[PDB]
Each structure stands twice: as C-alpha cells, then as structure tokens.
Amino acid sequence: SDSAVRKKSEVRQKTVVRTLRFSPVEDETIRKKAEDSGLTVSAYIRNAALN
Amino acid sequence: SDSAVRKKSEVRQKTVVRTLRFSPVEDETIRKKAEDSGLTVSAYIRNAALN
Description:
Strand content of chain A: 5-15%
Number of strands of chain A: 1
Oligomer: homodimer
Assembly: dimeric
Radius of gyration of chain A: 18 Å
Shape of chain A: elongated
Entry title: NMR Structure of NikA N-terminal Fragment
Chains A, B: NikA
Helix content of chain A: 40-55%
Largest interface: A-B, 23 and 23 residues
Structural class of chain A: alpha+beta
CATH class of the domain at 23-51 in chain A: Mainly Alpha
PDB class: dna binding protein
CATH topology of the domain at 23-51 in chain A: Arc Repressor Mutant
Keywords: dimer, bacterial conjugation, relaxase, DNA binding, DNA binding protein
C-alpha cells in the first residue's frame, strides 16, 4: 500500500547495521584514545575511518 | 565445575561485540577506501582507528 506523492512508508536501509568485533588490545587502545579526546568510541571509530 | 589448571570454559570475552552503525555517505566512503586499499571494511575500520 503506497502512492506516488505518498511513499513515506519505507525507502532502503540508508544506514549499515553490522556486528563488529575487536581484540582486548585494539579495544584498550581505542577506549583510551576515545576518552582522552572526549569523543565516544562510536564517534572515534567513524571519525578515524573518514579522517 | 572447574579446577585451578582446568578453567578454559569461559574466562572472559576478550573480544568486544557491538553494533556500529554508519550513514550511507560514510558507508560509501568507507566502502571505497577499504576496497581501494585492498582491505575489507572491517580491517579498514580497525586499522584506521588504531593508527
């Protein structure tokens, strides 16, 4: 059930949703880097990935 | 049930497990840098965030 000018129901999953994992070492480094910079780990990850 | 020298059942989840979401703009860029660098998006993320 949709129409031309009324399709706000769904589009596509713009965002990517995946289960990512890391070792205790990588996590330790990232956790310390994130907190020192005053950026949460999620922001730190995506930030470093684009910068 | 354990023993001092037989405790390999579940010490601690040293690996981290989380859902890290990414926008389509970021996802496309990460897909492009990862593939151009000849790395998987996961390796690219972890590597860029550690260095």
